[PDB]
């Protein structure tokens, strides 16, 4: 089946640049070792303000991770997580950039921080979601539950806590090997 998948990710200024770099190379990584004709991809940076970093358009018209991530600049400004969601739900997810109707819709939402904002998510209850929470900001119980509201149920599957971004990495093969 098709699979539609967004990677909707931090460009907060908690995040130091080797930090967000290796976010910029994780997303590369994930797009060359899911690439087939089932997956289109998008990306969208969050911070303060949203930006469509690439649509699903600009997927099949490059398909080159190296060219679609070109001309991200790390925002570094605050983590509105609630507002990032509902920008991917409702400005990314759209048949006129791209989008399949008939493809399993997925995000992959990474951060480091707690989100400055509020609301809920409501518009984005049909897209699958997982959340990556990583580094020292999720030391606590408290912190790393904060992250569950955003995510699809049940947390253990789909709420993953890296104490590290090296542990990006280790992500691969369960992405790889989801069936949707």
């Not at 931090?10 to 690439?35: A, T, W």
């Amino acid at each position: 089946g098709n699979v539609d998948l967004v990677f909707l990710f931090d460009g907060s200024m908690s995040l130091q640049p080797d930090e967000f770099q290796k976010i910029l190379d994780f997303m590369k990584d994930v797009m060359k070792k899911l690439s087939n004709t089932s997956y289109q991809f998008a990306a969208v940076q969050f911070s303060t303000s949203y930006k469509t970093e690439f649509d699903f358009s600009d997927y099949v018209k490059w398909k080159d991770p190296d060219a679609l991530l070109k001309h991200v600049k790390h925002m570094l400004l605050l983590t509105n997580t609630f507002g990032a969601i509902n920008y991917v739900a409702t400005e990314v997810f759209r048949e006129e950039l791209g989008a399949r109707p008939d493809a399993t819709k997925v995000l992959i939402i990474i951060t480091d921080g707690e989100a400055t904002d509020s609301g809920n998510i409501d518009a984005a209850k049909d897209i699958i979601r997982y959340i990556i929470g990583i580094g020292k900001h999720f030391q606590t119980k408290e912190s790393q539950e904060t992250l569950h509201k955003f995510a699809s149920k049940p947390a253990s599957e789909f709420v993953k806590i890296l104490d590290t971004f090296e542990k990006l990495k280790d992500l691969f093969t369960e992405l790889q090997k989801k069936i949707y």
